[PDB]
A paper describes a structure:
However, to confirm that this is indeed the catalytic pocket in the C. albicans protein, we next sought to determine the C. albicans FKBP12-FK506 structure. Interestingly, initial attempts to obtain crystals of the protein-FK506 complex failed, as the intermolecular interaction appeared to be strongly favored, leading to the production of the same apo crystal forms. Thus, we generated a P104G mutation in C. albicans FKBP12 and crystallized and obtained the apo FKBP12(P104G) structure to 2.0 Å. We next used the FKBP12(P104G) protein to obtain the structure bound to FK506. The structure revealed that, similar to other FKBP12-FK506 complexes, the immunosuppressant binds in the active-site pocket, surrounded by the 40s, 50s, and 80s loops. Comparison of this structure with the apo C. albicans structures with bound self-substrates revealed that the 80s loop that is inserted into the active site of the adjacent subunit binds in precisely the same location as the FK506 substrate/transition state homolog.
Residue numbers in the entry: 5 to 124
């Protein structure tokens, strides 16, 4: 499943649940270290609804703590938390990927900051 490493610690009280909307700042890199996207470089944070299949599965799993099932190496991310998500080609864009930006069978690394959840 996805992998999460916690670089920094949030409030530890605010966690996203499926159907919740989250706001995130992120940089996305390949395992080789080349950046393919940054929310901050754009100057705009990303907002989405998690747990509805709106975004790739690795994002849905990490943000909702696996829909509350819990997971191996799956620590929960809270508001103000900084974490690294490693997403396998499954749970992301797969064998096809999305040209131009992503090659076939790519493992993706996201460095993310969870600015807010829902009302916040
Ligand atoms: C005209 C409007 C298009 C509309 C584009 C935007 C609102 C701007 C928004 C910042 C996207 C960025 O545009 C610069 C750019 O973000 C990336 O760089 C990226 O960091 C990424 O991977 N993200 C974004 C952050 C959340 C996780 C993931 C995602 O799941 O995002 C979602 C995603 C691509 C889902 C695919 C869709 C195809 C399915 O087949 C596949 O199923 C496996 C899942 C995004 C939100 C789409 O739902 C919404 C859109 O497409 C992609 C590398 C390519 C993507 O551009 C496409």
């Amino acid at each position: 499943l996805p992998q999460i490493e916690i670089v920094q610690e949030g409030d530890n009280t605010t966690f996203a649940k499926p159907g919740d909307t989250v706001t995130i700042h992120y940089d996305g890199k390949l395992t080789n270290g080349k950046e393919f996207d940054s929310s901050r470089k754009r100057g705009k944070p990303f907002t989405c609804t998690v747990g509805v299949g709106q975004v790739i599965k690795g994002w849905d799993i990490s943000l909702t703590n696996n829909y509350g099932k819990g997971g191996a190496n799956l620590p929960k991310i809270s508001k103000g938390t900084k974490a690294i998500l490693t997403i396998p080609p499954n749970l992301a864009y797969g064998p096809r990927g999305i040209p131009g930006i992503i090659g076939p069978n790519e493992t993706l690394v996201f460095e993310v900051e969870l600015l807010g959840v829902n009302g916040q």
